[PDB]
Design a protein around this ligand. Structure first.
Ligand SMILES: [Zn+2]
Ligand SMILES: [Zn+2]
Lengths: 114, 48
């Protein structure tokens, strides 16, 4: 779910199992630096690929000129009855025609998808 | 015989009636409203 790097030579960390204490042991095999990982996860792959695109969308896309501009469907944190709607248009990441609403206020940026 | 009776084509063979033009514009408007309706259904994710 996440990776980190070595400390004193600053290299990439590889897994290792421990023969005695039976705990997974991430280690740099360019070194002898051994430590445990609290995540206890090494590999995950969402093959159907239902990632959350709410973190994917830049908060500054709303201030685009050539994007659409609706008047209904107001924002949540602020009222601001004006918003922009568009689609993801990302290849290989699903086929949904469902719309991605972003608030267009200069200091807002709470985006929602209904 | 065509030398006598004569064949042609012109603007008058392309002009339709005003009622015809109104019907064509109504059909086009209805088609545009229907495609707006189906794309609105596709926007809110109800198109099976
Ligand atoms: Zn190292
Ligand atoms: Zn807002």
């Amino acid at each position: 779910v996440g990776i980190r790097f070595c400390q004193e030579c600053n290299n990439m960390l590889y897994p290792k199992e421990d023969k005695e204490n039976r705990i997974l042991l991430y280690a740099c095999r360019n070194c002898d630096y051994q430590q445990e990982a609290d995540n206890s996860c090494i590999y995950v792959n969402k093959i159907t690929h239902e990632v959350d695109e709410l973190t994917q969308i830049i908060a500054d896309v709303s201030q685009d000129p050539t994007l659409p501009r609706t008047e209904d469907h107001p924002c949540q944190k602020c009222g601001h009855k004006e918003a922009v709607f568009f689609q993801s248009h990302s290849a290989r990441a699903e086929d949904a025609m469902r719309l991605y609403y972003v608030c267009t206020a200069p200091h807002c940026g709470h985006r929602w998808t209904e | 015989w065509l030398l006598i009776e004569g064949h042609t084509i012109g603007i008058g063979d392309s002009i339709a009636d005003s009622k015809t033009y109104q019907d064509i514009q109504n059909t086009i408007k209805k088609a545009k409203q229907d495609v707006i309706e189906v794309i609105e259904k596709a926007h809110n994710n109800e198109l099976e």
